[PDB]
């Protein structure tokens, strides 16, 4: 029977070490961590991430300032408080919500953000830099995924690592995640013949295609590490992930719940990025 | 067997040819010829051999070219008003800085102060990042040349399982976003593999990119592979041969490139195609 990856308990944990941070940042009389986070209309869902990230940030003791801006803003607008934003030195992470209106420029408005405090760790710089094998700010959901393979004291090094999905929110950067981490690294997708091949292959195995059930549990190689990432919700309310959770753990050696698995990471890696621009890059001692 | 050879000397004529189509066309039309900055500090003979083959080999295409050469003691901030200067100037389409620097300088530090938009190499983190997440601009010379010895000669990479010998960030790391651009599925070996073989053996498109002569015998060549060897290595002998035991691989592989003659030659046509996409997209559109 597989080991959990309780990735609510390292999520809190992560949390708790920040929080403990800023904690000792205020003792020495140094600013907290400033999140600053830009919205251009009133979509419900957007609605909802500002609360997230407000919510996260009043949790460990930040400053969060929150942009909430018309629909007629111009694009130009934006970028201006982008520049001023970049300029501000007590912010140290910007997010701007997506979706913009239509006839924003999103990639001109997010590539505007200065890399040191793009604290979601996708402007193309900080992907390449990672890319790179000298990684600044992250995407968030793939470092937190390596927080929990460190977290469980997994050695990563020479492990055969296959990813199922290859988006640019999750595969890509986590194949560079695990190449950095010592894995040979193996990025599937929707043209990978014979996937089944691979999973049975693979020590580590991170899927992250958001269909449930698309890996069946019988192909995981017994011993595996198995990183859930889908989080799909199932018409009688109950939420699964793209790997079939209970034939899978009886091969594994870990495995990822769905729901409290990778999901808490993604947050809590948020919140980690922003304290280290201010630690690191904006308000170094 | 008898692989068909994959004749990189032959398509970078091609290709220098096409550009310099352009070029003239450019110059017909009353246009600026793309222009190449080149940065020297310093006096090794390290330097001055890469250099002239460019002063010239973008000069064969009708590029202008201007070096730079500056005193070893350059200060690392003159260095850097430099590079502000070639990047505002309209008439620069590509910057190349060489490398080593002097000590003392930060390497880093001078190289991501190009702008992208005239990183011909393709090494700045920006242009990696927009390369690994879909969206490339300016790309990494061996593997954009690799991509297009694969274009030309209509091999279909869409589902390949491709491996990459090596992770390096000048080859084995953009190699395997290219590829994954292009389709495949995308293994990337290195010094932590456990049994290089296996994945070798399964390989329908091979890269190798480890700079040691024969270090992958042809036993390892999967029946069909299509092979791509970076290596050049000199030999206490004169001239080059290649990461792949030529012989042995081409009775099994169905492509395969030689050595000299196979990548050497694309890496260097992609950097002027990259100049002048840099020139017509970029700069002068």
Not at 123 to 149: D, E, F, M, S
Not at 243 to 262: M, N
């Given at each position: 029977?597989?080991?959990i990856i309780?990735?609510?308990?390292?999520?809190?944990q992560?949390?708790?070490?920040?929080?403990?941070?800023?904690?000792?940042?205020?003792?020495?009389?140094?600013?907290?961590?400033?999140?600053?986070?830009?919205?251009?209309?009133?979509?419900?869902?957007?609605?909802?991430?500002?609360?997230?990230?407000?919510?996260?940030?009043?949790?460990?003791?930040?400053v969060?300032?929150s942009?909430?801006?018309?629909?007629?803003?111009?694009?130009?607008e934006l970028l201006?408080?982008?520049?001023?934003?970049?300029?501000?030195?007590?912010?140290?992470?910007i997010?701007?919500?997506?979706?913009?209106?239509?006839?924003?420029?999103?990639?001109?408005?997010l590539?505007?953000?200065?890399p040191?405090?793009?604290?979601?760790?996708?402007?193309?710089?900080?992907?390449?830099?990672?890319?790179?094998?000298?990684?600044?700010?992250?995407?968030?959901?793939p470092?937190?995924?390596?927080?929990?393979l460190?977290?469980?004291?997994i050695?990563?090094?020479?492990?055969?690592?296959?990813?199922?999905?290859?988006?640019?929110?999750?595969?890509?950067?986590?194949?560079?995640?695990?190449l950095?981490?010592?894995?040979?690294?193996?990025?599937?997708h929707?043209?990978?013949?014979?996937?089944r091949?691979?999973?049975?292959?693979?020590?580590?195995?991170?899927v992250?295609?958001?269909?449930?059930?698309?890996i069946?549990?019988?192909?995981?190689?017994?011993?595996?590490?198995?990183?859930?990432?889908?989080?799909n919700?199932?018409?009688?309310?109950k939420?699964?992930?793209?790997?079939?959770?209970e034939?899978?753990?009886?091969?594994?050696?870990?495995?990822?719940?769905?729901?409290?698995?990778?999901g808490?990471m993604?947050?809590?890696?948020?919140?980690?990025?922003?304290?280290?621009?201010?630690?690191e890059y904006?308000?170094?001692?």
């Amino acid at each position: 029977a597989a080991k959990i990856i309780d990735g609510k308990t390292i999520a809190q944990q992560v949390r708790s070490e920040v929080a403990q941070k800023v904690q000792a940042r205020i003792a020495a009389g140094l600013r907290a961590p400033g999140l600053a986070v830009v919205l251009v209309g009133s979509n419900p869902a957007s609605q909802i991430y500002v609360a997230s990230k407000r919510k996260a940030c009043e949790e460990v003791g930040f400053v969060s300032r929150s942009y909430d801006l018309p629909e007629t803003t111009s694009e130009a607008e934006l970028l201006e408080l982008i520049d001023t934003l970049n300029a501000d030195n007590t912010i140290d992470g910007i997010l701007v919500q997506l979706p913009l209106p239509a006839g924003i420029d999103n990639v001109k408005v997010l590539e505007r953000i200065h890399p040191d405090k793009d604290v979601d760790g996708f402007h193309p710089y900080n992907v390449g830099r990672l890319c790179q094998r000298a990684p600044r700010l992250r995407p968030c959901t793939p470092r937190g995924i390596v927080t929990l393979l460190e977290r469980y004291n997994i050695d990563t090094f020479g492990l055969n690592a296959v990813v199922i999905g290859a988006s640019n929110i999750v595969g890509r950067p986590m194949s560079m995640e695990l190449l950095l981490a010592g894995c040979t690294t193996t990025v599937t997708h929707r043209f990978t013949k014979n996937l089944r091949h691979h999973v049975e292959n693979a020590d580590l195995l991170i899927v992250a295609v958001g269909k449930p059930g698309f890996i069946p549990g019988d192909w995981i190689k017994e011993g595996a590490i198995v990183i859930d990432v889908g989080i799909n919700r199932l018409e009688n309310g109950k939420v699964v992930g793209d790997v079939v959770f209970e034939d899978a753990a009886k091969r594994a050696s870990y495995i990822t719940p769905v729901p409290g698995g990778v999901g808490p990471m993604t947050v809590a890696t948020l919140i980690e990025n922003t304290l280290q621009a201010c630690v690191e890059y904006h308000d170094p001692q």
